[PDB]
Amino acid sequence: QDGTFDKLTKKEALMRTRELEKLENSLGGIKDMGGLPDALFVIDADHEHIAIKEANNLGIPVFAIVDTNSDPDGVDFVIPGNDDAIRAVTLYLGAVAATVREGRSQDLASQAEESFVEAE
Amino acid sequence: AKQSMKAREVKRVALADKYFAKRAELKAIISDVNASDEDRWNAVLKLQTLPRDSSPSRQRNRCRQTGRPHGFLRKFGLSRIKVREAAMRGEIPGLKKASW
Amino acid sequence: PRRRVIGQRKILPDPKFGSELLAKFVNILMVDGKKSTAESIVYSALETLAQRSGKSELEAFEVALENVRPTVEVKSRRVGGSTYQVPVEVRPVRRNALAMRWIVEAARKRGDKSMALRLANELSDAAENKGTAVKKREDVHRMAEANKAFAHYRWLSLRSFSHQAGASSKQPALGYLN
Amino acid sequence: GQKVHPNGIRLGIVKPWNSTWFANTKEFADNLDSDFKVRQYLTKELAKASVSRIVIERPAKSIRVTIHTARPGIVIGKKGEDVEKLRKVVADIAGVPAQINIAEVRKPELDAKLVADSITSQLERRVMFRRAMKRAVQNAMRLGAKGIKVEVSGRLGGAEIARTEWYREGRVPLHTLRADIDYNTSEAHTTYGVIGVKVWIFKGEILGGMAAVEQPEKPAAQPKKQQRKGRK
Amino acid sequence: ISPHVNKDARDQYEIRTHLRLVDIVEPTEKTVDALMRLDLAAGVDVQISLG
RNA sequence: UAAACGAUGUCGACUUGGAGGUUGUGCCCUUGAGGCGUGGCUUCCGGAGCUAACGCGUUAAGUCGACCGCCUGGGGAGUACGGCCGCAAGGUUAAAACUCAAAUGAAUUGACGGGGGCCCGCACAAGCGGUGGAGCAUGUGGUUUAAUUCGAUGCAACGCGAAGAACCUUACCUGGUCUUGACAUCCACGGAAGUUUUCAGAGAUGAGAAUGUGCCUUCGGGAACCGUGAGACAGGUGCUGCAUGGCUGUCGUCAGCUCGUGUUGUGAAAUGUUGGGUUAAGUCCCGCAACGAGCGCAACCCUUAUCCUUUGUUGCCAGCGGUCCGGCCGGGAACUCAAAGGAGACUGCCAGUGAUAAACUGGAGGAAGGUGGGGAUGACGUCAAGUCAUCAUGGCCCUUACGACCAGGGCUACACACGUGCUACAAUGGCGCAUACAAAGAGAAGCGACCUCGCGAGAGCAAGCGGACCUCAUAAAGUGCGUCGUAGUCCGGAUUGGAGUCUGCAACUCGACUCCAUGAAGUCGGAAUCGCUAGUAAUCGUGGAUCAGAAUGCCACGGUGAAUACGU
């Protein structure tokens, strides 16, 4: 955005522009993440089985929504579900976020008040 | 390597000066066209045996750095292999890769 | 091999007439790079033609290059224990250049005292379709009519088009077995 | 075993030469052979110091040595006497009387040749060499630079075969024509014959230490440059 | 390019020599003095003979 | 009898199931060889367990259950032997001495497939030209004498290391000559070294004459340098490239190679490095337990092109003056022109295609649109590639020598074969007479104005040079007119005789240049045999590194300059 690598040949700038684009699309909504996350959110296991495997070895509590060919096995809470129908998977996702997030809104104000007793 | 090609290079310079200096134009003066009805006398051209080693015809030199035979270059005092070796480490002034 | 199709340099209408048919000709008339000699010969031929008929200087030149023309070439592409042959159609740029080459192959042994007379005279012959490359055009078509039986790796190739989710007819395109 | 030597191709652009003189063709060989003799016989005299490079220059009637060192004092010695004994014997060697300056000291812990001298020294003393090449790379990248390649030769452990090993890490470009990149091929001895270490170490892709001039002829030098336009 | 044999591959080197003239239409003696007092180069040879 | 089997001994009991192939039978819109209900064999899939691995998985090769058959390394031997059976080969249970350190179940990756298929390089194709056949030139083997020295031999060697072989040089061979040494350091003894010069000797080498007495000095004597003599040592083309170091070649611009790290396997190792889309490329979009990154490729880089620009001579002269209309000069910058600031071109714009995408093609100005043309430019590495001979160097030998000077001979010999390039076989040309414009560089062993001599070339003399000044240099093919027809000619000119010229003691075999006369091989070469995508291939001349005197080679430069790249 400064204009900094676009000099010399078009090749040296473009092979960076195109890679910046591949990274930007892949990482844009996870970019600030400072460390291994506190829980794991599965809406479908069909290609992402590995994310569940690794999370369990790192000792993270697992929250799953598993499809019909997936197994219910080896996680901390499961919802048995199915992977088809774009109207179903949308409703499963709207529901999960509310319970964690407005519990969280209340938590943040509480935490300042908890922390302040120490410094008093 | 051989000591004989180094021994040669040292021997020629006192003998260039000793035989050759008096003899410089003497091939032209006593023998060639400048001897038109003048000189042409054997007894003053039997004297070119002495400059025989000190001759322009034996300034083939070969390397000064190593004394190494065959493939010589006067402009380095070197040969093919030995030029390239000094050039790799940047020892020769002005020498660069050629592109055009 | 070869990722995509590549084109070719282009020769440019001659400075004395403005003709592409001359400009392609002067090039197959070239001996030891010497195209400015092959120019004097081409244009001195055209004035000799104009003396047989003054109605066009390019008249017998242009029609010779229609009449002695090859359309076809023969290719080889193995079938098992035997190689056989398959005719293939030649591209216009090489159809023209084969036909001009053959007029000039004959003209340089014709023994007339100048290549300008020799060449003009071998255009008189091939213009009426009576000359030296009439047999050479016929022989090349005889091979294409005789060898219409065989195809390029014929036993496996007939399965391969229908099996590569290609069509039920011989695919002229990269990564089908041809 | 492919490739032209890496520093051999850079000497016309943005790297200066190992020697800088002019001798007008006919005397060019007698001057290179003297420049070679002063290089060969001088590095033996400063054996007791540490040195990374030598750059020899022949102005008129004078030979000027520039020398590159691990630290400013080492060649200088006690009351300037040590460097005055260098300049005395370069004058004896050379076909002219001699001058000497010490350069600025730069990256002595990272230099190609002071690392390759260190790795050969292990081989000279017949150590098992189990970790040596890796610990070379580790310490060289711990002290600086952006990539290192090490290649070790000499019939390792004393074998009756050739037996190599090598290790590259980070970035080491190979065909580069711009910036310095520091390479040294050491040759050194042990009990069974010659052993040797090759050290490519890499500081940067851009060095400005030689570049083409800023300006066209007209704005550089004299304000009044203009000619009469005839009047012979 | 190799030490021995391997005939095909070779190496090619160039050396240029650049000549500049200036062309002082009249040089003052104070220019010739300054050239000669301030001399120390190896990278350029200056030729002070004429032609 | 065997390959008598889910590549399960038998049967039996127990163990989440779903579905197929397909079948009794209740029920369905009797709405997939369909579903449910309730049985079926038979089988795929996968969870527990089990395996070395494939594999099994509810019909086990799981969990076990009972009982029988049978094994105890390979080879030799599934035979021998004994009992029994079979016209009869055979069948049945089933072996040792002896030899041997392995044989055998499974998996990874390479190379490979003639199993299937994709992809790349001028690798073929699509052609074109050269070589193999001729001559010369030059190299290799065969072969030869005193000796014709070697290094190197599928594409990596045969015009290569070994760029200029009468001696020398130059590996060799012969004849001459001495041993610290024809080159350094050091000592003992004589001479200064250096120069000029007679004579013996081939010359090396020695004696003698004549010039000189420098350098340092208890003023003995010595260094430098030589003669003479020892050692330490110099010297060694002295051997080993499974003993090496340094360095580079091959494939190949192959289009790939690897590091950190996770997971899957018991691990060797995979995966990523492979797919879809796109490129010159592992280039780049999408993306699977592979993630992140680096090397090569990419880049900086020179060089050139037009084109803007400044310099203005050893560069230039649209115009104007003196004037034969010559930059010679009053004078000019318009002008190439030289080297340098650089400018232009970025799949960037715009259009179409392409999965959003890289990218290919079109459109427009311009010398030019496909990162402008050209080059630099080759990952890591088997190849036991190749150098001990640039040079380092251990192991390891002579050092009155495995050293070195001087002369003569030699590679280039000659019997041929084989490799390569030149020049030719034609007429695109040769011949005669007339006629034209270069580029780039080289020139203190060197070239050289002027000069006079010469038949062109050249020559000796010499001011001189630093090369935008002067010279090599007369650039050639090409241009003009007439002439010639496959006959070795009107092409090609080797051979050889003779004269004029050159560098050198010396030009016979092994040197150069000019020129007169005659004059052979060769009519585009079977086997064989290569580079090439466009300033390329082809073809012509020129210059140069080396270089006493040798260029067909090599190296760079400029003239004229092609077929096609469909297809794998």
Sign of the alpha-carbon torsion through C12, C14, C15, C18: negative
Amino acid identity of B86?
Answer: A
List chain E residues with CB under 8 Å of B89: none
Beta-bridge partner residues of D57: D20, D64
What Cα–Cα distance (Å) separates residue C127 from each residue in C16, C120, C122, C123, C130?
A: 23, 10, 8, 6, 8
**Chains in contact with B, counting 3 or more C-beta pairs less than 8 Å apart as contact:** D, E
Asked whether E and C share 3 or more beta-carbon pairs under 8 angstroms, the answer is no
Structure tokens that stand for E2 in this block: 């190799």
User: In a 10 Å sphere around its CB, with 0-12 CB exposed, 13-18 middle and 19+ buried, how is residue C17 labelled?
Assistant: middle
Contact D21, D36 (CB under 8 A): no
Contact D157, D120 (CB under 8 A): no
CA-CA distance, C112 to D58, in Å (whole number)? Answer: 73
Asked whether E and D share 3 or more beta-carbon pairs under 8 angstroms, the answer is yes
CA-CA distance, C65 to C93, in Å (whole number)? Answer: 12
Beta-bridge partner residues of B43: none
What Cα–Cα distance (Å) separates residue D12 from each residue in B51, B95, D103?
A: 45, 7, 22
What are the b/e assignments for B46-85, b being 16+ CB within 10 Å?
eeeeebeebeeeeeeebbbbbbbeeebeeebbbbeebbbb
Q: Distance between alpha carbon A49 and the CA centroid of its chain, in Å?
A: 14
Q: How far is the CA of A43 from the C1' of F356 (A)?
A: 26
User: In a 10 Å sphere around its CB, with 0-12 CB exposed, 13-18 middle and 19+ buried, how is residue C127 labelled?
Assistant: buried
Q: How far is the CA of C106 from the C1' of F124 (A)?
A: 30
CA-CA distance, C122 to C118, in Å (whole number)? Answer: 6
Look at residues D126, D186, D177 and name the one whose alpha carbon lies nearest to residue D152: D186
Structure tokens that stand for D74 in this block: 């080492």
B92: left (phi over 0), alpha (psi -120 to 50) or beta: beta
* CA angle at E22 for the pair E20 and E25, rounded to the nearest 5°: 150
- Output the DSSP codes for D200-229: EEE--S---SS---SS-TTTSS-S-----S
Breaks (C–N over 2.5 Å) after residues, chain C:
none
Q: Reduced to 3 states, what is the DSSP secondary structure of residue E25?
A: coil
End-to-end CA distance of chain C: 13
- Measured between CA atoms, the residue of chain B closest to residue E17 is B94
Q: Which of the 8 DSSP states describes residue D19?
A: E
Residue of B81, B94, B100 with shortest CB distance to E15? B94
Q: Which of residues 57-86 of B touch D (CB under 8 A)?
A: 64-65, 74-78, 86
8 Å CB contact of B91 and D39: yes
Contact D102, D109 (CB under 8 A): no
Please tell me if residue B98 touches chain E, with a CB cutoff of 8 Å.
yes
Q: Which of the 8 DSSP states describes residue A23?
A: H
**CA dihedral defined by C103, C104, C107, C108, rounded to 10 degrees?**
-160
Q: Which helix (H) or strand (E) holds D165?
A: strand D165-170
CA-CA distance, D56 to D44, in Å (whole number)? Answer: 16
8 Å CB contact of B84 and E1: yes
Contact E42, D22 (CB under 8 A): yes
Q: Which of the 8 DSSP states describes residue D80?
A: G
CA-CA distance, D127 to D157, in Å (whole number)? Answer: 8
CA-CA distance, D211 to B88, in Å (whole number)? Answer: 21
- Output the DSSP codes for C35-86: HHHHHHHHHHHHHHHHHH-TT-SSHHHHHHHHHS---EEEE---BTTB---E
8 Å CB contact of E1 and D4: yes
Structure tokens that stand for A26 in this block: 């892949």
Look at residues C8, C156, C161, C35 and name the one whose alpha carbon lies nearest to residue C91: C8
Sign of the alpha-carbon torsion through D174, D176, D179, D184: positive
Please tell me if residue B28 touches chain E, with a CB cutoff of 8 Å.
no
List chain E residues with CB under 8 Å of D21: 42
Residue of D15, D17, D28 with shortest CB distance to B75? D28
CA-CA distance, B94 to D18, in Å (whole number)? Answer: 10
- Measured between CA atoms, the residue of chain E closest to residue B100 is E14
CA-CA distance, D36 to B25, in Å (whole number)? Answer: 37
HSE, side-chain direction, 13 A CA sphere, residue A105 = 7
* CA angle at D8 for the pair D7 and D14, rounded to the nearest 5°: 60
Q: Look at the block and give the residue holding tokens 């078009």.
A: A10
Helical ranges in chain E per DSSP H: 29-38
Q: Distance between alpha carbon C83 and the CA centroid of its chain, in Å?
A: 25
- Measured between CA atoms, the residue of chain B closest to residue D15 is B90
Three-state DSSP string of C88-130: EECCHHHHHHHHHHHHHHHHCCCCCCCHHHHHHHHHHHHHCCC
Contact B54, B19 (CB under 8 A): yes
What are the b/e assignments for C29-52, b being 16+ CB within 10 Å?
beeeeeeeebbebbbebbebbbee
Q: How many CB pairs under 8 A join D and E?
A: 21
Structure tokens that stand for D88 in this block: 């005395």
Q: Which of the 8 DSSP states describes residue D197?
A: E
Asked whether A and E share 3 or more beta-carbon pairs under 8 angstroms, the answer is no
Q: How many CB pairs under 8 A join B and D?
A: 62
Q: Distance between alpha carbon B30 and the CA centroid of its chain, in Å?
A: 24
Structure tokens that stand for C63 in this block: 């029609």
CA-CA distance, A118 to A108, in Å (whole number)? Answer: 17
CA-CA distance, D8 to B86, in Å (whole number)? Answer: 9
8 Å CB contact of D29 and B75: yes
CB atoms within 10 A of CB D198: 17
Look at residues C8, C151, C5, C142 and name the one whose alpha carbon lies nearest to residue C71: C142
Contact D196, D120 (CB under 8 A): yes
Amino acid identity of D194?
Answer: V
Please tell me if residue B95 touches chain D, with a CB cutoff of 8 Å.
yes
CA-CA distance, B68 to D35, in Å (whole number)? Answer: 19
Taking the CA of residue B89 and the nearest CA in chain D, the distance in Å comes to: 6
8 Å CB contact of E13 and B96: yes
- Output the DSSP codes for chain B: --HHHHHHHHHHHHHIIIIIGGGTTHHHHHTSGGGTTS---HHHHTTSSGGGTTSGGG-----SSS---SSEETTTTEEHHHHHHHHHTT-STT-EE---
Q: How far is the CA of D151 from the C1' of F384 (A)?
A: 20
Q: Which residues contact D184 (CB under 8 A, 6 or more apart)?
A: D111, D112, D113, D115, D116, D198, D199
List chain D residues with CB under 8 Å of E1: 4
Sign of the alpha-carbon torsion through A43, A45, A46, A49: positive
Q: Phi, psi at residue A83, to the nearest 5°?
A: -75, -20
Measured CA to C1', the nucleotide nearest C11 is: F562
Residue of E14, E39, E42 with shortest CB distance to D57? E42
Contact A86, A67 (CB under 8 A): no
Sign of the alpha-carbon torsion through D66, D103, D170, A11: negative
Interface test with E, best of D2, D19, D22, D213 (most E CBs within 10 A): D22
Measured CA to C1', the nucleotide nearest D4 is: F248
CA-CA distance, D46 to D75, in Å (whole number)? Answer: 7
Residue of E1, E4, E13 with shortest CB distance to B95? E13
Taking the CA of residue D117 and the nearest CA in chain E, the distance in Å comes to: 25
Q: Distance between alpha carbon A45 and the CA centroid of its chain, in Å?
A: 14
- Measured between CA atoms, the residue of chain B closest to residue D12 is B96
Beta-bridge partner residues of D74: none
Please tell me if residue D41 touches chain B, with a CB cutoff of 8 Å.
no
Domain ranges of chain B: 1-90
* Determination technique used: cryo-EM
Look at residues D173, D196, D70 and name the one whose alpha carbon lies nearest to residue D122: D196
List chain B residues with CB under 8 Å of E16: 94
CA-CA distance, D70 to D107, in Å (whole number)? Answer: 8
Structure tokens that stand for C101 in this block: 């080459």
Measured CA to C1', the nucleotide nearest C97 is: F563
Asked whether C and A share 3 or more beta-carbon pairs under 8 angstroms, the answer is no
Contact C110, C133 (CB under 8 A): no
CA-CA distance, A15 to A28, in Å (whole number)? Answer: 20
HSE, side-chain direction, 13 A CA sphere, residue C142 = 6
Helical ranges in chain D per DSSP H: 28-45, 81-93, 112-124, 132-143
Structure tokens that stand for A24 in this block: 């930007």
Domain ranges of chain D: 16-106, 107-206
Structure tokens that stand for C111 in this block: 């023994």
**Chains in contact with E, counting 3 or more C-beta pairs less than 8 Å apart as contact:** B, D
